[PDB]
TrEMBL record, chains A, D:
Family (UniProt): Belongs to the hantavirus envelope glycoprotein family.
SS bond partners: C8-C123, C42-C129, C81-C100, C105-C110, C147-C157, C177-C216, C205-C311
Subcellular localization: Host Golgi apparatus membrane; Host cell surface; Host endoplasmic reticulum membrane; Host mitochondrion
Protein name: Envelopment polyprotein
Domain of life the protein comes from: Viruses
Length: 331, 422, 422, 331
C-alpha cells in the first residue's frame, strides 16, 4: 500500500482553492502499463475525462551492432494526466475530483506517479479512502494541518503574500503543473514554447507551434495558477525554473543520443533524446513543440529533448514538479 | 505638606567628576542638588538623562542564503567523447561534473559495447529545490550613539553624543569615550526570519573557497547565483557485465542542514526598533551586552547668582490611583504637575508615602499643567501614596487594597530596617 | 639563583576585565601571569604595553599675527572737497579715515581761509612698523591615537588603537572609548616663537568684526592684509585763528601689546615631538592634561594547552653597575638578557636585591643576546643589586657606594616596614 | 643734550659690518639751517664728503589771496646726507665714519635728524663722545648688547638667517637707507624709479631717468644692503615698504596741492606736493626722479610728491627709515 497524503486547511475560505497530493508507486513491467486503470472507493465525484482512451506515439530503443535501434508506433493509453481545458480551473465550482497518473519508465519498467486534485470540501467528508492502480493499493490520508493560517512547508508554518500590488519572509514551496492542449484560431497567444524561447534564446526558431498552457497548484493547496500569466511573479518563477530544469526538480546510466519518428508515420525524424538504462528518474511523457495539434509521446528508456535553447525535435513534459521561493510571513 | 524625600545635596567645594558604565538597553537618570559652599540655603538642581544605546553598523549586503538537496546521476556512452554530448545536470542551477573520458576498459563495461578506451562515463552532482532560508549581512564599520540631556538650574541643553563628540556647555561636559561591544567588524549577521526575531553571528562565513556544507555555500547574490564546490571525491563502482554506476563518498547535508543541526554552537542576538537601509543597519540591543563609558564633569565656577534668579516653580497634586500595595502586583499613580516661571524644566516625580518612595518618573515639563504617570511596587496596608517633587509633596494621598529597563539615582537616603516587614 | 620577586598571579576562573585612565604624557606597563584553574603549575605571561597619547588636530592656517604702532595725522584744505585730494595715510598698510567734508565754519578756521562751508578737514589713522609676532591656527577637528602591544603566552600582537578601532585578538581585546581633552574644536592656538616653545589658547579670536586691540586684529593672511577698524570716535578740536587739529579718544595700544600686558589671563600649553603639515598638527602633550579611557578584556577560554608548548626561555646576567645607593643619586644597571626558543618576546627586567626591586625596564627581546639598561633609585650599603626576570635572577650582583613618565604595574607584593630605614 | 645710542655687538665677527645710530633734534628756525655744521669731539676718522657745499633747490610756500604762492631758488647746503658711491659700502675697510643730517621742516622751523655710521671697532675705542650741531650738543653712547648672538629688537634678542640658499622665528627690524647718485653710460640698470614703477604701476611712464640706488643698514648693526639687489629677499622687502610708505614709517595739518619749478630756472613746473602747517613730520629733502643728473630739493612746509603710481613731478627721498620682517631665531 502506497500513501497519498492530503494536507487539509482549517477553513475553506474564499471558495476557489483545491487540495492536491501525489505519490510515486513501485515499478510495473511495460506490458502491464497499457492495462492500468485507476479505481476509487473514495466518496468524491471523479471527473471521467482522464480514464478515456488517448493516442500516444510509443518510442523505444534497443541495443544494436550508431549502437542504437529506435522504433515507434501509435497506441492508446488510458488514465494519464491529459486534463482538458477548464477542468482543473473550475473544479472548485463543479466539485469534481481529478485523479490521473504520469509514467516514469526505463526500457522494461514504469513507475506510475498518481496525482489527486480536488475540492477542499473533501477534507470535511473524508479521513481516508482507497485508490487502486493495477495490483497496487493506495491509501489516501486526509490530515489536518499543524498551522493556524498557512501550510507546513519544510517543517515551518507559512502564509504567502495575498495583495495584487507590490509592497517579508521567504519560503520555498512545491509546484505541480499539468500540460493542457488549447488552440485559438488566430495569433500566437497560446504558443507556449515561444514563451520559453524568449526567456532562454539568442536567435529566432522557425517552427514551434504547439498551443497550450500549464495549470499548476502551489503547495498542498491553492487556487489554480495559469502559466503563463505575464504580469504574475509566480508564473515568471515557474517558467524560469522550467527553463533551467525542463524535466522537473528533486543510479541512472546515460548511453547516448537517439532520434525517432513521431508520429511513426513520419518519413524523417521529428524527435530526439538521450537513451538511458537503470532506474527511471524523470517522467517519460510529453508533447512535440513543433505541432499545433499535439503529438503525444511516451518514450520509455529515453529522456526526450526538453532543452528550450534547441530549436528542433524538442518536447514539453505532460507534468512538471518543482520548487519556487514565495514571499510571505512565517508566523 | 512636604516630607524629607529630597535628593542628594552636594557641596561644590571642588569639581564634580563622574564615570559611568551604561548597559546597552538601559537608560540612566542621575540627579542631585549642587550647593553653594558660601550659602547653605542656595541650591540649584542638576539633572542628567542618558538614553539607550543606538548601534549603527555600515553593512555589506551578502544576499540570500539558499538551501538545496543533493543529487547524483551517471551517464554512460559507448563511443565518442565526454565533451561531445549534453547531460541533464549541466542545465541545473548548481552542478559539478567529473567525467572519466576515454577510460572505458572491460571490467567496468556493460553487456553491450565490447570496446576498450572508447567510451565515456560522466558523473553529475547537482542541487535542486533551491529555496531561500535567510538573509546575510557583513559588518564593515560600527558606530554607537546616545542622546543626553542636562538640566542645571534654569538652563537646559540636549545633544546626541557620538564617540567623536561631546556635549560641552559653559559648566557641564559629557563625553562618550569607550564602548565594549559584543559585535565587531568582519562579522556576518544572519536573519532567518524577519528582523525583530533576531539572528545569528558567523565569523568563518566562506567567501572565496566555499564548499557544500559550509555557512554561506549557496548564495543568491543580486548579480546571480554563486555555487560552491563539493567536499569529497568521485569513484567508479562497477561489476561484471553491468553498466558502471558512479559513487560519491563525501558530504551530503547542505550548509543550512548542518547549521540547524548544530545551531546551539553559534552566537545569537536580538534587535529592537530596527532600521535597515541600502548602506546601514540601526537597532537597539535589548540583551544588555554592551557597555558605554561616559565621563561627566561639572566645574565649581557655577555662578550660583545667575542660576538663582527666577527658578522653576513646580506644584503637584495626586489625582488618581490604580493597583495594589502588594509586593508583586504594582500600582499606577497619576499626578497633575503644574510648572510655572519656566518654559521647559527637566525633573522627575516620585510616588512616595510617609516613609519611602516606591517609584519614579522622569519627564520634561512644559509651562502649565502636566499629567504624569508613576508606576510603583510595594507599600503596606495603611500606605497613603502621594506625588512628590524634591521636597514638596501633594496635600493628600490615596490608598490601594490587597525591570522597565530604567535606572534611577537621586542620592536619596533610603529607609533602614524600620520599613521592612511592617 | 632565583628569588620571590614574581608578578601577580591571577586565576582564570572568570574573565579578566580592566578599565584604565591613562594620562596624556604617560606610558603604562601592566603585566601579570594568568593561571590555569585546573593546574596550579600552568601559568602563561600576559603583558600590556600602551604608549603615550598622540594628538592629531586638523587645523586651519589663520596666518601671521602682526603688531603695529598707532598714528594720527590731520589734513586741512581751504577750498574744494575732501574726495578731491590725496593724503599720505591712504597709501599705508592699514588706514581708517574720517573726514569733515563741507563742514568748514569760522570758529575752527585758521587765520587764512575766510570762508564758510567750503573747506575740508580730513583725519587719518594709520598703522606703521608692521612686524610679525606669532603664528595662529584654528582647530577644526581632533583625533587621539595610542599604540598598544600585547603579549600572551607565545603570541605577540601590536596595533595603533584609534577612537573608532580596537586591537581585537582571539583572546584579548583592547578598546579606546573616551578621551577627556583640554583642547576642543573652534580654539585658536598661537605660537609666539617656534613650535617646541609651546603657545597660548584663544577662544574669542576675532574673525568678522575685528577692532584694534582684539586678539587677531591685524593679520597677514596669504591672500593679503586684513586690517581691522578702530574702537573709538573722532572729533575736531580747534581754537580761534588756528588750524583745526584732529583728536581721537579711543584705544591706542595694539592687540599684541594688550596680550603681553594680560598674558597671565590666557591658557598656556606645551608640545613635544611636533609635526605640522598643510592640513594637520600632531604633537604629544607633556603637561599630562588629557586622560584616555581604555577597556581591556581577556576571556577565560585561553586554551592553556596551546599557549604552553615551547614557551619563551629567558636567561640573564648582571654585567655592570654605575651610580650610588643613596635615595636621590640613582644607579644604572646593565643586564645581558638571552632569549631562546622564541623569535620575539615582550617582557620586562627589574633591578632587584635580596628584598626589593628599585627599578624596571620593559623591552621587546629578540632571539639571542640583548643588552638592557635599568635605572634605579634607593638601596642600602650592603645592597647587592641583581638583574631579575619574573622569578629567575642572575647568579651574582654588584654593589654601589655613597619621573621618567613611565608607570609600572606588575602586581608584585612590595616589602613592608622591614625594608624602611635599614 | 640729545642722545645718539649705538648698540655694540660682543664680537666684530666677519669684518664688514657697520654700527648705525640716529637721533632727531629739536626745531631750529629756517634762517639757521644754512649755517649748521657738524662738529665732533669723537675719536674716530670722519669722512669729509658730507660737510662740503651741496647745491639744492629751495622750494617754499606762502598763503595768498589757488590760495598759495610758491617760489624757488638755488642755494648751497652743507652737512646733509648726500653720501658718495662706495663710501658706506667700504667704510668697514677704510675705517671711515659717516656723520651727516637730514631735515624735517615746516615753513618756519627744521628738525635735523643726525645719522652716525661707522666701523664696529669704534665700540672698542669709545664709550661716549660728543657731536655738536649749531647750538645743540649730542651725547653718543656706545652700549654693549644684552644679547649673546644677536641684537635687542622689540625687547627680544634676535639672530637673522645667514645662508644664501632657501631653507623660523620672525622679527620686525628697523632699516635706514641713504640715496646715492650713481650714473652709468649705457642702459637702464641704475634707473631706480623704473624699479618702483614695475612694482606699483599699471601703464608705461615715459621719463623717469634718475640714476642711483639706496644703501641701507639693518637694525643697529649690519653689512650694507644695496637696493635693489634683485634676488635678495630683504631688498624686495625694503622696496615694497618704500612703495607703500614713500616718506618712511613711524599735529600736522594739510592745506592743499602746490607746484613749483625745480630748478628755479625752469620755465614750467617740474615738481608737486602737498603744503602743510604744524609740526614737521616727514623729511623735507629729495631728488627729482625725472632727471638723470640729480636735482636736489629742499621743500620746507611741503610734502613733496613721492607716490610711485604717479608719472610726473615726483621725487625720491634722500633718507628713508622703515621696518621689515626678518626670518631667524629668537634664542
Ligand atoms: C528498469 O528499472 C527496474 C526497477 O528499477 C529494474 O528492474 C529491477 O532490477 C533489480 C536489480 O537489477 C531487480 O532486483 C532483483 O530482485 C530480486 C527479488 O528477490 C532479488 O532476489 C535479486 O537479487 C539478486 O541479484 C543481485 C544482482 O546484483 C545481487 O546483489 C543479489 O545478492 C541477488 O543475487 C535482484 O536484485 C528487480 O527484481 C527488478 N525490478 C523489476 C520491477 O523487474 C530494471 O533493471 C531496469 N531496466 C533496465 C533495462 O535498466
Ligand atoms: C613749525 O614747527 C614749530 C615746532 O613744532 C612751531 O613753532 C612752535 O610753536 C609752538 C606752539 O605754536 C611754540 O610754543 C610756545 O612756546 C613758548 C615757550 O615759552 C610758550 O611760552 C608759548 O605758550 C603760550 O602759547 C600757547 C598758545 O596755544 C598757550 O597754550 C600757552 O598757555 C601760552 O600762552 C607757546 O606755546 C614754540 O615756541 C614754537 N617753536 C619754535 C621753534 O619757534 C611752528 O608753529 C611751526 N610753524 C608753522 C608755520 O606751522
Ligand atoms: C541546451 O542547448 C544549447 C544549444 O544546443 C547548448 O548550448 C551549447 O553548449 C555548448 C557546451 O555547453 C557550448 O559550447 C555552445 O557554444 C552552446 N551553444 C549555444 C548555441 O548556446 C546547451 O549546452 C544545452 N544545454 C544542456 C545540454 O544542458
Ligand atoms: C597714488 O597715485 C595714483 C594715481 O594718481 C592714485 O590712484 C587713483 O586713486 C583714486 C582714489 O583712490 C582712484 O579713484 C583712481 O582710480 C586711482 N587712479 C589710478 C590710475 O590708479 C592713488 O590714490 C595715489 N595714492 C595716494 C595719494 O596715496
Ligand atoms: C533574545 O530574547 C529571548 C527572549 O526570551 C532570550 O531568551 C534570549 O536570551 C535573547 N538573546 C540573547 C542573546 O540574550
Ligand atoms: C610647560 O612647561 C613648563 C616648563 O617649566 C611648565 O612650567 C609649564 O607649566 C608647562 N605648561 C603647562 C600648561 O603646564
Amino acid at each position: 500500500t502506497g500513501e497519498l497524503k492530503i494536507e487539509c486547511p482549517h477553513t475553506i475560505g474564499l471558495g476557489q482553492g483545491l487540495v492536491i497530493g501525489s505519490v510515486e508507486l513501485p515499478p510495473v513491467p511495460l506490458t502491464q502499463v497499457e492495462s492500468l486503470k485507476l479505481e476509487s472507493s473514495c466518496n468524491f465525484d471523479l471527473h471521467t475525462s482522464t480514464s478515456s482512451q488517448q493516442p500516444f506515439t510509443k518510442w523505444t530503443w534497443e541495443m544494436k551492432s550508431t549502437s542504437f535501434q529506435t522504433k515507434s508506433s501509435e497506441i492508446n493509453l488510458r488514465g494519464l494526466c491529459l486534463v482538458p481545458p477548464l477542468v482543473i480551473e473550475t473544479a472548485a465550482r463543479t466539485r469534481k475530483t481529478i485523479a490521473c497518473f504520469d509514467l516514469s519508465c526505463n526500457q522494461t519498467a514504469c513507475q506510475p506517479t498518481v496525482f489527486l486534485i480536488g475540492p477542499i470540501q473533501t477534507c470535511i467528508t473524508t479521513k481516508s479512502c482507497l485508490l487502486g492502480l493495477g495490483d497496487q493499493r493506495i491509501q489516501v490520508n486526509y490530515e489536518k494541518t499543524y498551522c493556524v493560517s498557512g501550510q507546513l512547508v519544510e517543517g515551518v508554518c507559512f502564509n504567502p503574500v495575498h495583495t495584487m500590488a507590490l509592497s517579508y519572509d521567504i519560503v520555498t514551496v512545491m509546484v505541480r503543473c499539468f500540460l493542457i492542449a488549447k488552440k485559438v484560431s488566430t495569433g500566437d497567444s497560446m504558443k507556449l514554447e515561444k514563451s520559453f524561447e524568449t526567456l532562454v534564446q539568442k536567435t529566432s526558431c522557425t517552427g514551434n507551434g504547439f498551443q497550450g498552457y500549464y495549470i499548476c497548484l502551489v503547495g498542498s493547496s491553492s487556487e489554480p495558477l495559469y502559466i503563463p500569466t505575464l504580469d504574475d511573479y509566480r508564473s515568471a518563477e515557474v517558467l524560469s525554473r522550467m527553463a533551467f530544469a525542463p524535466h522537473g526538480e528533486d543510479a541512472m546510466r546515460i548511453i547516448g543520443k537517439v532520434t525517432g519518428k513521431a508520429p511513426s508515420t513520419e518519413s524523417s525524424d521529428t524527435i530526439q533524446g538521450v537513451a538511458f538504462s537503470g532506474n527511471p528518474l524523470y517522467t517519460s511523457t510529453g508533447v512535440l513543440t513543433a505541432k499545433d495539434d499535439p503529438v503525444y509521446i511516451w518514450a520509455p528508456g529515453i529522456i526526450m529533448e526538453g532543452n528550450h535553447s534547441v530549436c528542433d525535435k524538442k518536447t514539453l513534459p505532460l507534468t512538471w514538479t518543482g520548487f519556487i521561493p514565495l514571499p510571505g510571513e512565517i508566523e | 505638606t512636604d516630607t524629607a524625600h529630597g535628593s542628594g545635596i552636594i557641596p561644590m567645594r571642588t569639581d564634580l567628576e563622574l564615570d559611568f558604565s551604561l548597559p546597552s538597553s538601559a537608560s540612566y537618570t542621575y540627579r542631585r542638588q549642587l550647593q553653594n559652599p558660601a550659602n547653605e540655603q542656595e541650591k540649584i538642581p542638576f539633572h542628567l538623562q542618558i538614553s539607550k544605546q543606538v548601534i549603527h553598523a555600515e553593512i555589506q549586503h551578502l544576499g540570500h542564503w539558499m538551501d538545496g538537496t543533493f543529487n547524483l546521476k551517471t551517464a554512460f556512452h559507448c563511443y565518442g567523447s565526454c565533451e561531445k554530448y549534453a547531460y541533464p545536470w549541466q542545465t541545473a542551477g548548481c552542478f559539478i561534473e567529473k567525467d572519466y573520458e576515454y577510460e572505458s576498459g572491460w571490467g567496468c563495461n556493460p553487456p553491450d559495447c565490447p570496446g576498450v578506451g572508447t567510451g565515456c562515463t560522466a558523473c553529475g552532482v547537482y542541487l535542486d529545490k533551491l529555496k531561500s532560508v535567510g538573509k546575510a549581512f557583513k559588518i564593515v564599520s560600527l558606530r554607537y550613539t546616545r542622546k543626553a540631556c542636562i538640566q542645571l538650574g534654569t538652563e537646559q541643553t540636549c545633544k546626541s553624543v557620538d564617540s567623536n563628540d561631546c556635549l560641552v556647555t559653559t559648566s557641564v561636559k559629557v563625553c562618550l569615550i569607550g564602548t565594549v561591544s559584543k559585535f565587531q567588524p568582519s562579522d556576518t549577521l544572519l536573519f532567518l526570519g524577519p528582523l525583530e526575531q533576531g539572528g545569528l553571528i558567523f565569523k568563518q562565513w566562506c567567501t572565496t573557497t566555499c564548499q557544500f556544507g559550509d555557512p554561506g555555500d549557496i548564495m543568491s547574490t543580486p548579480v546571480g547565483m554563486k555555487c560552491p564546490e563539493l567536499n569529497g571525491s568521485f569513484r567508479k563502482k562497477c561489476a561484471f557485465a553491468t553498466t558502471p554506476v558512479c559513487q560519491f563518498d563525501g558530504n551530503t547535508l547542505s550548509g543550512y542542514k548542518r547549521m540547524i543541526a548544530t545551531k546551539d554552537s553559534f552566537q545569537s542576538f536580538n534587535v529592537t526598533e530596527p532600521h535597515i537601509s541600502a548602506s546601514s543597519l540601526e537597532w537597539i540591543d535589548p540583551d544588555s551586552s554592551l557597555r558605554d563609558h561616559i565621563n561627566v564633569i561639572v566645574g565649581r565656577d557655577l555662578s550660583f547668582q545667575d542660576l538663582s534668579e527666577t527658578p522653576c516653580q513646580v506644584d503637584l497634586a495626586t489625582t488618581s490611583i490604580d493597583g495594589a500595595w502588594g509586593s508583586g502586583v504594582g500600582f499606577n499613580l497619576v499626578c497633575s504637575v503644574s510648572l510655572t516661571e519656566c518654559s521647559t524644566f527637566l525633573t522627575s516625580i516620585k510616588a512616595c508615602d510617609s516613609a519611602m518612595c516606591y517609584g519614579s518618573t522622569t519627564a520634561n515639563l512644559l509651562r502649565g499643567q502636566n499629567t504624569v504617570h508613576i508606576v510603583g511596587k510595594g507599600g503596606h496596608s495603611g500606605s497613603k501614596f502621594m506625588c512628590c517633587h524634591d521636597t514638596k509633596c501633594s496635600s493628600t494621598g490615596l490608598v490601594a487594597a490587597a525591570d522597565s529597563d530604567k535606572i534611577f539615582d537621586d542620592g536619596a537616603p533610603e529607609c533602614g530596617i524600620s520599613c521592612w516587614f511592617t
